[PDB]
Design a protein around this ligand. Structure first.
Ligand SMILES: Nc1ncnc2c1ncn2[C@@H]1O[C@H](COP(=O)(O)OP(=O)(O)NP(=O)(O)O)[C@@H](O)[C@H]1O
Lengths: 268, 7
């Protein structure tokens, strides 16, 4: 089965809206050209798929803040991934573009949920490597965030990474200057970028020189507690960055809204 | 000007 187990619809951005005809579940149908893949892995059963598939299988167990792979298919020249599609949905990059700099209460709820999702990944041995507002979807009714696009991801390891294919402006200074990083510490850097994006309405750094200068100028009013968390995540030295635990125990991170509260207060 | 950033 393939083309008629899913009624397929319009382009989203090569990703199509689909409905699984066996039960009308909304889905997203992602096509990936074999030529444009550089990383491959093997599933539990041995067979050789794109890394993206391997990583999504590993995290698609149970419920979480990550968009789940429901199925996939090989074609002669492509793979096709069937993903959860929540509805109504908007990605965080568009949400921030329209709303501007988010209120701290809202930024705290989003950022916490992204931290839970990234922790979930790491627990499954998966490093995303492209955390950013464009790779985050907001389910507007439930107030739940979901991570997408594992296409630059890797298996989590504790040794150094010398390859990177994510977004440069969310990449850390050790990558810019030395083409090396460690997973968690890089992930925390990009989480600092993302947090600034939320409270200020745009990312802090556009150019390599700004990234390695680590001078964080705040363009909107932001509380001292939040500025501190952000500066901590954006420490130049990787070992000076906070662990995931220290981020979630930070004073600015306390008394988070539940997802449904977040929807009711800020999204409905 | 706020913009998206490709991989
Ligand atoms: N459930 C969903 N899963 C994935 N993408 C979605 C979903 N719903 C909407 N989209 C849109 O599809 C866009 C592209 O998906 P993404 O997973 O980022 O692919 P990409 O890496 O940019 N390109 P490619 O993987 O080469 O097709 C997103 O930015 C979303 O706005």
């Amino acid at each position: 089965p393939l083309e008629s187990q899913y009624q397929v619809g319009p382009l989203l951005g090569s990703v199509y809206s689909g409905i699984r005809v066996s039960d009308n579940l909304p889905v997203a149908i992602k096509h990936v050209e074999k030529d444009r893949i550089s990383d491959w892995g093997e599933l539990p059963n041995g067979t050789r798929v794109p890394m993206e598939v391997v990583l999504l299988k590993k995290v698609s167990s149970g419920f979480s803040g990550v968009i789940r792979l429901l199925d996939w298919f090989e074609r002669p020249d492509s793979f096709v991934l069937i993903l959860e599609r929540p509805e109504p949905v908007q990605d965080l990059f568009d949400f921030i573009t329209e709303r501007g700099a988010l209120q701290e209460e809202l930024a705290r709820s989003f950022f916490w949920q992204v931290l839970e999702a990234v922790r979930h990944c790491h627990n499954c041995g998966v490093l995303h490597r492209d955390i950013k507002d464009e790779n985050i979807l907001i389910d507007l009714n439930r107030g739940e965030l979901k991570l997408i696009d594992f296409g630059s991801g890797a298996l989590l390891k504790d040794t150094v990474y010398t390859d990177f294919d994510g977004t440069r402006v969310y990449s850390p200074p050790e990558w810019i200057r030395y083409h090396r990083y460690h997973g968690r510490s890089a992930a925390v850097w990009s989480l600092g970028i993302l947090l600034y994006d939320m409270v200020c309405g745009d990312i802090p750094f556009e150019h390599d020189e700004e990234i390695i200068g680590g001078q964080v100028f705040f363009r909107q009013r932001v509380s001292s507690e939040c500025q501190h968390l952000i500066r901590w995540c954006l420490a130049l030295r990787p070992s000076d960055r906070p662990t995931f635990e220290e981020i979630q125990n930070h004073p600015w991170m306390q008394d988070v809204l539940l997802p449904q509260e977040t929807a009711e207060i800020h999204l409905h | 000007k706020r913009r998206r950033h490709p991989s």
